[PDB]
């Protein structure tokens, strides 16, 4: 019925930076006062920070400042702090006659920059217990690295795999600000027992790290 288009969908900025999250109205309600800004921490309920475009709620640090322009509303954090890294949603109330509804934004994930770190790559063969069930999962672990962008490729007897793997990534660790990633290659017991060499290639920029095992060797 209307759309609160947010921007950027995610951003990275170190402590003390000045962050600017914007939120547009798809149509034009000319002048809307009932726009708010919410904050949500991982696994937590949303928390309100700004109401009525610019009114700072009591208890909210004054670094959060709300700004208006009729249709484009802007959240501004002057000096970024450690507790300010979360997801921010803009919400606005709109209504005409037989229509009334709130509209949230896509959100903005505010992540913290840090020194690039290379992952500790580990590869795990399928357990013999699983083979009895007819399927073999091979798992590759990328532990405690930065940034999140990495290409993880699977080779079975040096043939690049495709379509048989799924990835999962954690959130930024609250301590070291690093990510951990797992890539799970799913093979049939028959296909797993036909081939010998299983490899995981992790590519970040100009570095590729491959960890492999031979089926049946310790």
């Amino acid at each position: 019925d209307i759309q609160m288009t947010q921007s950027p969908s995610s951003l990275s900025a170190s402590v003390g930076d000045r962050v600017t999250i914007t939120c547009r109205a798809s149509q034009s309600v000319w002048r809307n006062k009932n726009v708010a800004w919410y904050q949500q921490k991982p696994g937590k309920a949303p928390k309100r920070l700004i109401y009525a475009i610019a009114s700072l709620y009591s208890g909210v640090p004054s670094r959060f400042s709300g700004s208006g322009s009729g249709t484009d509303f802007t959240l501004t954090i002057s000096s970024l702090q450690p507790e300010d890294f979360a997801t921010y949603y803009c919400v606005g109330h709109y209504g005409s006659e037989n229509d009334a509804y709130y509209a949230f934004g896509q959100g903005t994930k505010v992540e913290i920059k840090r020194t690039v770190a290379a992952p500790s790559v580990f590869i795990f063969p399928p357990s013999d217990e699983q083979l009895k069930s007819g399927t073999a999962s091979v798992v590759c672990l990328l532990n405690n690295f930065y940034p999140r962008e990495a290409k993880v490729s699977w080779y079975v007897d040096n043939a690049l795999q495709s379509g048989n793997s799924q990835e999962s990534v954690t959130e930024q660790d609250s301590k070291d600000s690093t990510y951990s990633l797992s890539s799970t290659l799913t093979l049939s017991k028959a296909d797993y027992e036909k081939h010998k060499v299983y490899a995981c290639e992790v590519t970040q920029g100009t570095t590729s790290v491959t960890k492999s095992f031979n089926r049946g060797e310790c």
Partner: protein, 215 residues
């Protein structure tokens, strides 16, 4: 103290109807208007509808066809009811006075509505430590082929929390979920320290404990 409480969550088979009820303690539900908002796992916030402090209820486009918000001043509650449930309706459901233009805004803690076509306990397989590891080794558990979410994973009944990564579950092409929990430990402990993952799957009342031994 908590003043806005959601109740009536749980699991519901597809096509069934969720019946959630917001409850206020310390004030009145007639004195303010209240919204229902939901959040799918790993997704943004989505508005369902709201009920004015007067008594007229408004719904969003998707929720119009299916939803229904009523209240009862006798018990200080407002109640959401949907129908024709499906996979995308699985979410955490909050009631809240959004207060986008007024001072008073109050949220609930939320409640989980899970839409399930089946109930399957998990299979837990070991992620055996590296034999090629005096530094740090990696070990863990593979929680495969369960439904619906979620499973909780702890290590040695909670004693081991440092360096543990329990990844978000992915949906496999089979339509079953799968996740890994991993931990990095010093290599010298692999003959001394016992490592057990505790996987609980409340939907199927299954808990699996698995000892992760080298080799």
């Amino acid at each position: 103290e908590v003043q806005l409480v959601e109740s009536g969550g749980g699991l519901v088979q597809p096509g069934g109807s969720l019946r959630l009820s917001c409850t206020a303690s310390g004030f009145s539900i007639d004195s303010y208007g209240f919204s229902w908002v939901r959040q799918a796992p790993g997704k943004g916030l989505e508005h369902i509808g709201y009920l004015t402090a007067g008594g007229r209820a408004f719904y969003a486009s998707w929720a119009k066809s299916r939803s229904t918000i009523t209240r009862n001043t006798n018990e200080n509650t407002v109640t959401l009811k949907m129908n024709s449930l499906r996979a995308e309706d699985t979410a955490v459901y909050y009631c809240a006075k959004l207060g986008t233009g007024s001072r008073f805004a109050i949220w609930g803690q939320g409640t989980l509505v899970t839409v399930f076509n089946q109930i399957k306990g998990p299979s837990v397989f070991p992620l055996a430590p590296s034999s090629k590891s005096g530094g740090t080794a990696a070990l863990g558990c593979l929680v495969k082929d369960y439904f619906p979410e979620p499973v909780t994973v702890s290590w040695n009944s909670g004693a081991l929390t440092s360096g543990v990564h329990t990844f978000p579950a992915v949906l496999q092409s089979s339509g079953l979920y799968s996740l890994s929990s991993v931990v990095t430990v010093p290599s010298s402990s692999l003959g001394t320290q016992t490592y057990i993952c505790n996987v609980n799957h409340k939907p199927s009342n299954t808990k699996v404990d698995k000892k992760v031994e080298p080799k």
